[PDB]
Amino acid sequence: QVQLVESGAEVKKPGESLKISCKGSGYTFTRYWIGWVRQMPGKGLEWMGIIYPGDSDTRYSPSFQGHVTISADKSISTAYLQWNSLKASDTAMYYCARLPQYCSNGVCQRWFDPWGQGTLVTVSSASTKGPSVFPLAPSSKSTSGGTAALGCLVKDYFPEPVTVSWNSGALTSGVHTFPAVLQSSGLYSLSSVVTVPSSSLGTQTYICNVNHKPSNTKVDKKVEPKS
Amino acid sequence: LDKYFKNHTSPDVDL
Amino acid sequence: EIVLTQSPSSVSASVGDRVTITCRASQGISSWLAWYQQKPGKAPKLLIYAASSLQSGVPSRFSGSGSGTDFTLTISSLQPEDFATYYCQQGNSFPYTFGQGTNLEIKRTVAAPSVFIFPPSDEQLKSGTASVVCLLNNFYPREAKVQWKVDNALQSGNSQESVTEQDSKDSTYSLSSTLTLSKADYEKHKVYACEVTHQGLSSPVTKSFNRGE
């Protein structure tokens, strides 16, 4: 229905410029204010600004005025957030969101609905690195009570994020994709596990689908019982 | 209408 | 700017309990307060707009009230899927501001972890490194202790762990711990063991394997 689609991840070096995008569909893009919000560490959200795509009128938070530029191309129903010169501390999840409004006599009150999925922007001097993906094979040591655990270990990547699905999204019950840890090297690792019937290990196929957009890495790893 | 909806209640808003 | 302060900052409650979160604004914002739910790793979702209007498709256990400077979000009968961070937001005055967020967690009965262990894959060994993984599945409460033992010697300094967010269906946690060694070191020892201590367990559970077999 109403949807805002942004990229899930962008990685740049300090001093580089960046423009991220948010494409609206399922509504008349020119008729709604649309804006950007920054995710704060742990908890918290900071509104950055809004634009009216009908005429490109903008309003910024005082915290973000002059640090970013918001723009829009109504031809392709797309809004943008841009930095001229990135800092490492600009790293964050950024959301675009539509702002429905209620007005009387030209005075408007606004909220955010709906929100895009969020774009994780990482600014770092460190090298981008694709993950190695290893099977966590089900075995006599990961089977108990009729349940088998199996998984994938996604090791030595930078930066976040990695996405993991199982069987191209058909397998979701019992999946735990863990928060990544930061290794001593400054690389990330994570594991994704699933619990399934021990009885059908012989007949079912389990494939973890790992995507690391920053390195354009896609791995499909078939996880077979230990033999 | 681009101009109208800039400062009137949005099309999907009720209450 | 208008500062929004949510109270409390964290709440823990049982399935079926009434939960109430308040938002106090530094100045009057009339009725122009919205409430959002945000799950870990996901975008916020609108629950309530204009103080008391329920978003379409949002369960009726959610309700908002208030005007001026004192607003309340109420969940009448808490469900496991309500685990989230909740935010209020004023849209009356520039700049638009959000509250600091309230974390809502579910209290439930104790659940012991199911413990599983995974040797390194042959594929990883080819690359010169050996990661052994210990999984603690679906336990409550979150506090758990994992110790690694290699040939019965307690390890320090060579593992990392992480815990999941609370599960949206059963309100449990899971934990993954990885022991990482060089292939050379891995090949010099036989018995690899994960030892798990948790409230749900009478005595510590050890899961182990021999590299030999």
Side-chain angles (χ1 to χ4, degrees), chain A residues 6-221:
Chain A
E6 40 191 319
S7 175
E10 300 290 341
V11 187
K12 294 283 179 169
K13 295 171 196 311
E16 294 188 327
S17 73
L18 171 67
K19 178 187 268 184
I20 65 175
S21 67
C22 177
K23 193 161 161 53
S25 61
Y27 81 99
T28 303
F29 187 68
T30 53
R31 288 178 185 158
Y32 289 79
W33 293 86
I34 186 163
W36 294 92
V37 173
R38 174 176 189 168
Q39 175 76 60
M40 302 316 278
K43 289 190 294 197
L45 297 161
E46 286 183 3
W47 174 66
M48 301 173 73
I50 58 181
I51 188 164
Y52 192 68
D55 68 354
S56 272
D57 193 4
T58 58
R59 187 73 176 256
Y60 298 89
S61 170
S63 291
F64 294 91
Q65 180 75 242
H67 297 295
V68 298
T69 299
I70 296 164
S71 64
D73 187 340
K74 73 182 119 155
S75 328
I76 57 163
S77 302
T78 293
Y80 300 101
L81 176 60
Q82 177 181 236
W83 298 259
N84 287 341
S85 189
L86 286 165
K87 291 153 19 172
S89 70
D90 289 322
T91 297
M93 186 73 71
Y94 292 94
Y95 295 101
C96 70
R98 188 180 70 163
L99 294 83
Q101 70 188 4
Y102 176 90
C103 312
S104 43
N105 301 111
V107 174
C108 303
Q109 297 83 23
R110 301 203 176 92
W111 58 93
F112 294 91
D113 185 39
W115 296 65
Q117 81 216 67
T119 299
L120 184 50
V121 172
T122 307
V123 185
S124 171
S125 304
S127 286
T128 292
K129 189 180 158 108
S132 302
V133 182
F134 305 117
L136 297 167
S139 77
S140 65
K141 296 297 183 162
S142 72
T143 42
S144 188
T147 292
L150 56 101
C152 282
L153 179 65
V154 180
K155 183 159 160 64
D156 289 341
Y157 66 91
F158 185 82
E160 298 204 73
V162 139
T163 63
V164 184
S165 65
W166 288 90
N167 289 354
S168 303
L171 181 51
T172 63
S173 299
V175 173
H176 297 298
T177 295
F178 286 83
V181 294
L182 184 60
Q183 297 175 105
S184 290
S185 61
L187 301 175
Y188 291 96
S189 288
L190 74 68
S191 56
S192 183
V193 302
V194 62
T195 55
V196 299
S198 297
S199 64
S200 62
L201 291 169
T203 57
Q204 310 308 292
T205 295
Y206 299 109
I207 299 171
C208 71
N209 321 110
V210 181
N211 181 215
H212 186 235
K213 190 169 181 157
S215 63
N216 300 298
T217 299
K218 276 183 196 201
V219 178
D220 298 309
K221 180 59 67 161

Side-chain angles (χ1 to χ4, degrees), chain C residues 40-61:
Chain C
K42 304 278 196 170
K45 277 78 183 144
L46 180 76
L47 302 168
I48 305 285
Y49 59 105
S52 59
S53 288
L54 184 61
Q55 166 88 313
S56 167
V58 176
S60 63
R61 70 176 177 278

Side-chain angles (χ1 to χ4, degrees), chain C residues 151-163:
Chain C
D151 285 335
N152 207 36
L154 171 65
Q155 300 294 291
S156 179
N158 51 4
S159 58
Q160 303 196 260
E161 64 177 45
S162 87
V163 65

